Amino acid sequence: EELKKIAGVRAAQYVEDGMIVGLGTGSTAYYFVEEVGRRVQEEGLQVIGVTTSSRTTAQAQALGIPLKSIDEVDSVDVTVDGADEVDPNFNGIKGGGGALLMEKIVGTLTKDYIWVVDESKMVDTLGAFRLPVEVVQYGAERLFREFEKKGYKPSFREYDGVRFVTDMKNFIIDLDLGSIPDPIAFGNMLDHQVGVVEHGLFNGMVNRVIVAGKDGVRILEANK
Amino acid sequence: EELKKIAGVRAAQYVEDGMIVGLGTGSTAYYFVEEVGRRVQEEGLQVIGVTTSSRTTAQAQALGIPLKSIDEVDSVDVTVDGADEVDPNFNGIKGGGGALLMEKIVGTLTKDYIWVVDESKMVDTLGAFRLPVEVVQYGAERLFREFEKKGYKPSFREYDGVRFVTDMKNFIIDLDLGSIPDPIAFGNMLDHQVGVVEHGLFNGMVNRVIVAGVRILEANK
Numbered sequence A: 001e002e003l004k005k006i007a008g009v010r011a012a013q014y015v016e017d018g019m020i021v022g023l024g025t026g027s028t029a030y031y032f033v034e035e036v037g038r039r040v041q042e043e044g045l046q047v048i049g050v051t052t053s054s055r056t057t058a059q060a061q062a063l064g065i066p067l068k069s070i071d072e073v074d075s076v077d078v079t080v081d082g083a084d085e086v087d088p089n090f091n092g093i094k095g096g097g098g099a100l101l102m103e104k105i106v107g108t109l110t111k112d113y114i115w116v117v118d119e120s121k122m123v124d125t126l127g128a129f130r131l132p133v134e135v136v137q138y139g140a141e142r143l144f145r146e147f148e149k150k151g152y153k154p155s156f157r158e159y160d161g162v163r164f165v166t167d168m169k170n171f172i173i174d175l176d177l178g179s180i181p182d183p184i185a186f187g188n189m190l191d192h193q194v195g196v197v198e199h200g201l202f203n204g205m206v207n208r209v210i211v212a213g214k215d216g217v218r219i220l221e222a223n224k
Numbered sequence B: 001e002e003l004k005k006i007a008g009v010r011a012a013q014y015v016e017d018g019m020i021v022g023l024g025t026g027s028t029a030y031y032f033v034e035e036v037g038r039r040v041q042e043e044g045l046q047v048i049g050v051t052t053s054s055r056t057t058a059q060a061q062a063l064g065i066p067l068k069s070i071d072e073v074d075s076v077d078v079t080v081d082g083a084d085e086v087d088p089n090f091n092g093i094k095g096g097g098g099a100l101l102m103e104k105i106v107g108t109l110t111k112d113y114i115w116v117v118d119e120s121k122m123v124d125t126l127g128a129f130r131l132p133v134e135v136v137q138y139g140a141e142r143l144f145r146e147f148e149k150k151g152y153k154p155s156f157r158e159y160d161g162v163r164f165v166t167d168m169k170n171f172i173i174d175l176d177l178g179s180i181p182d183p184i185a186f187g188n189m190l191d192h193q194v195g196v197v198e199h200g201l202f203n204g205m206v207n208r209v210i211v212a213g214v215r216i217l218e219a220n221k
Helices: A002-014 A029-043 A054-063 A100-108 A140-149 A183-191 B002-012 B029-042 B054-063 B100-108 B140-149 B183-191
Strands: A019-023 A047-051 A076-081 A110-118 A131-135 A154-156 A171-175 A196-199 A208-213 A216-221 B020-023 B048-051 B076-081 B110-117 B131-135 B154-156 B171-175 B196-199 B208-211 B215-218
Touching: A002 A029, A002 A076, A002 A110, A002 A208, A002 A216, A019 A029, A019 A054, A029 A047, A029 A054, A029 A076, A029 A110, A047 A054, A047 A100, A076 A100, A100 A110, A100 A131, A100 A196, A131 A140, A140 A154, A140 A171, A183 A196, B002 B029, B002 B076, B002 B110, B002 B208, B020 B029, B020 B054, B029 B054, B029 B076, B029 B110, B048 B054, B076 B100, B100 B110, B100 B131, B100 B196, B131 B140, B140 B154, B140 B171, B183 B196
Parallel strands: A019 A047, A019 A076, A076 A110, A110 A208, B020 B048, B020 B076, B076 B110, B110 B208
Antiparallel strands: A131 A171, A131 A196, A154 A171, A208 A216, B131 B171, B131 B196, B154 B171, B208 B215
């Protein structure tokens, strides 16, 4: 939690006057958003934020960070967001907090895409963290059954017994896959599944990973 | 028109007592739904319908066909739906009426999936009809621009000036591709596009196409 804050704050250093800046979601990106808001008020930093979720929108508006829709910009200069897992090939799993779909839409349109994480998110192979898959409401139960038949071990995302509904009005089914030896293939295969909106594998996307740990902060370059 | 009704009734002959039946839309498929409703009213037929559109839900409720969602049954035995285009390899363009997402969800779950159309929907190559592409609201305009830059001639689906919101709360962008000589590759490419929920290429799905004729064409499948 203190490590999550050092990572989110450090990332705010990559933001400059005149940037369009993607604003991530989740307990680590939250510190980055806070810090961007702090620089906008103390320094007069001139940015325009583009959101990745309704929670982030509310947080940015409270902080006074000016906002525009992804629709209203042609590209995003820098986006900082968290990750549930990051492998050594700079593929990740995202969506633990429910906002994978808008996070992938903004990440795809980002020139310098940065993840912030604590040391515990660096894994040798993706998959111990259940893969979030955003799914159409209509026919989701039939889809869940198909995923059970395939051995993906699904569960609906729910909080306090309430089935989770995303910002774009879908559900999430998490897949207990254990290990994803070829996340490119597996993402591309999930892309052909009718009833799947988006999934949480972010492959070949991130440019820089900022890792805060007990020993200090490491800045890991993907070098595409 | 008389032939379309004969074709829609002929497709209802695949429906038997005790089936779960998908109920679609289309200039010819409308007659198939009327005929199921008549067999329920007049011949004691016992079925459960699963519709692809809220216009068919109203139609079926007027006729007293009992309905359920796709989530409340195990398998759909027979689905009859329309199509905007069907090619000689039994791929098709659907979604001209806006219902592509529920049509594809119901189609995927169907054991005997039938399209019933008239001759003008049979084409040599798909593409003269605009391809519907159902898209996530957030970033839809930027995606429109990307499709424009790729030469796909997009237009947002709108009615009376109002951008169309699909049943699952997305927009549609129709692409004027002209000709889609490899619909499998094109659908694959859309399926990878971040921001696309679904698209109107139904490839390798349909079992049988019934054409006003009346002719019954069997797909490989």
